[PDB]
From Swiss-Prot:
Bilayer-crossing regions: none
Protein name, entry field: Soluble cytochrome b562
Superkingdom in the source lineage: Bacteria
Free-text remark on how the cofactor is bound: Binds 1 heme b (iron(II)-protoporphyrin IX) group per molecule.
GO molecular function, one term: iron ion binding
GO-annotated cellular components: periplasmic space
Residue range from the parent sequence: 23 to 128 of 128
Compositionally biased region (Basic and acidic residues): 47-60
Length: 106
């Protein structure tokens, strides 16, 4: 899918996670965020179209999704451990970290 749709998937499932009351619902939303993040990693954003993949900006662009998946996997582990509240807290701090890549390249 394109970058804007993957970003909508990330933004929407973060809303799903903070409204959830069961671990299965949290794990499902994180699973879709993981797919959207790995798919967003292969795209080129409009303001970086003049750059090559090995440019510092594009290495940094792909690196941001590596760290996002890292936090998704940790939250997925918490959800698999039945820790709904802790998984939701991980998602809130993860949500805060979304802003940095937008400030650079959005
Ligand atoms: C870079 C490695 C990113 C990180 C991590 C996240 N986002 Fe992102 N996002 C990024 C860019 C370059 C853009 C602009 C795309 C464009 O075509 O202009 C976006 C956009 C969004 C949007 C708006 C989508 C739209 O229809 O305009 C949203 C709602 C969004 N991003 C959400 C979002 C969330 C919740 C993130 C943390 C899970 C997140 N993004 C990370 C680049 C990057």
């Amino acid at each position: 899918a394109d970058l804007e749709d993957n970003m909508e998937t990330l933004n929407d499932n973060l809303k799903v996670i903070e409204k959830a009351d069961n671990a299965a619902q949290v794990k499902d939303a994180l699973t879709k965020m993981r797919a959207a993040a790995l798919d967003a990693q292969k795209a080129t954003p409009p303001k970086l179209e003049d750059k090559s993949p090995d440019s510092p900006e594009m290495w940094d662009f792909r690196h941001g999704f590596d760290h996002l998946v890292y936090h998704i996997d940790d939250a997925l582990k918490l959800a698999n451990e039945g820790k709904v509240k802790e998984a939701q807290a991980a998602a809130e701090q993860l949500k805060c970290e979304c802003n940095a890549c937008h400030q650079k390249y959005r």
